Amino acid sequence: KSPVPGNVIGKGGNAVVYEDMEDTTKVLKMFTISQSHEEVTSEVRCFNQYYGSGSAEKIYNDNGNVIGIRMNKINGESLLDIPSLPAQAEQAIYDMFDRLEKKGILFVDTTETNVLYDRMRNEFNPIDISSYNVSDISWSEHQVMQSYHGGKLDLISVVLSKI
Amino acid sequence: KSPVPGNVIGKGGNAVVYEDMEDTTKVLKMFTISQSHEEVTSEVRCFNQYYGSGSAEKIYNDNGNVIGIRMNKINGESLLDIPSLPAQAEQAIYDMFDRLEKKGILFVDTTETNVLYDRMRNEFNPIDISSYNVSDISWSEHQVMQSYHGGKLDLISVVLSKI
Structure with missing residues (x-):
């Protein structure tokens, strides 16, 4: 077993x-x-x-x-170790967030370490997926959207920097 | 409050x-x-x-x-972003493990991203500290020592590579 x-x-x-x-x-x-x-x-x-x-x-x-x-x-190599990315990867990263957002997931760990890039399929694959969660006791909507948005732009900017 | x-x-x-x-x-x-x-x-x-x-x-x-x-x-800059280290850093990393081991901690997350190096004091400072734990619920001594050792040599080898 x-x-x-x-x-x-x-x-x-x-x-x-x-x-x-x-x-x-x-x-x-x-x-x-x-x-x-x-x-x-x-x-x-x-x-x-x-x-x-x-x-x-x-x-x-x-x-x-x-x-x-x-x-x-999961397929792909760590984005940490990929100094350079093709232009079409811009769309790929937006695609990743689009997919996460449709599912209602507000991806938390947006650091480069937590994502793989499959250059063969031009896709970004998140490794450890977790979501922000609103609670009357810890996280408010505002807190959550603010942090979610910050992380997303951050990871995007990282991707744009490698192109 | x-x-x-x-x-x-x-x-x-x-x-x-x-x-x-x-x-x-x-x-x-x-x-x-x-x-x-x-x-x-x-x-x-x-x-x-x-x-x-x-x-x-x-x-x-x-x-x-x-x-x-x-x-x-914690003091230091991320070891990820430090491509080169002085020679005296070798001792510093062994010092870190010595200190963790005395306290009975079997440091788990030995990846470079989980350690900072304070070049001014020549010290390695672990960020997220957690320990392997032997349990009738899952981890045996053998399992634990094997994984603990592997991680330690791995992080050491990373440090040695930057010297």
């Missing part, structure tokens, strides 16, 4: 992403510490909403607790 | 880090979605354990839930 991790693909403050040795088209995001239900649910939801139903599923242990997420290995 | 965010300093899958306009020596890590008690507790613990008691405190809403963390603004 268990997941079978291969080499390390990525790292974050809460998980380590390994290859799935059982399936070359998937990766295993294994959490290093217990996550909230809302956060794990949202991560899966957002990923499936962007990449399609079946792109991410929770991984459970025998106790029925969530230990990670099995998700599609 | 509220936290007063300034400009954006950083972004992640679960939070946005803003300047604290009330205190130049602090930053506000505001979570975009609810976090588990263990994870937020572990984050504050690790941060205080590395940088000293009082380096990080939780920020609460009226419901008594945690909406973010107020923490010391």
Whole structure:
């Protein structure tokens, strides 16, 4: 039943992403510490909403607790390592945001590190997808739109700088 | 009483880090979605354990839930943007790991983007500190040591490459 991790693909403050040795088209995001239900649910939801139903599923242990997420290995190379981009990439980045916005996702982590560019298909693929969330208690609409807009223009400006 | 965010300093899958306009020596890590008690507790613990008691405190809403963390603004420039390092930096990176290991922290996120280098003091300062954790729920000692070691050698090799 268990997941079978291969080499390390990525790292974050809460998980380590390994290859799935059982399936070359998937990766295993294994959490290093217990996550909230809302956060794990949202991560899966957002990923499936962007990449399609079946792109991410929770991984459970025998106790029925969530230990990670099995998700599609995303195509592309890290935008960090791509000093130069073709002109048609401008449209590609707008396309990415358009798609996220239709799904109602207000993409949070707009840093270059969190996006891959597939030069062969001219597409930008976000890696860790999460959304801003309005709560009468933490985030207001205004706060959210302001931060969302700032991040989007930022990532766009980064893309425009590489053309 | 509220936290007063300034400009954006950083972004992640679960939070946005803003300047604290009330205190130049602090930053506000505001979570975009609810976090588990263990994870937020572990984050504050690790941060205080590395940088000293009082380096990080939780920020609460009226419901008594945690909406973010107020923490010391760390000195240094992002290692990503530093193409070249002096020779004495080799010792500095080993110093960082020594210090984390004494405190019992098995630093997880060893990527360059998660570390700052203070060239003036020749020090490496980790940003998002979290530790591997052995659990009957998922991670074995062997799994943990193997991944911990890999990350450490990886970050070290990055540092050595810039010298």
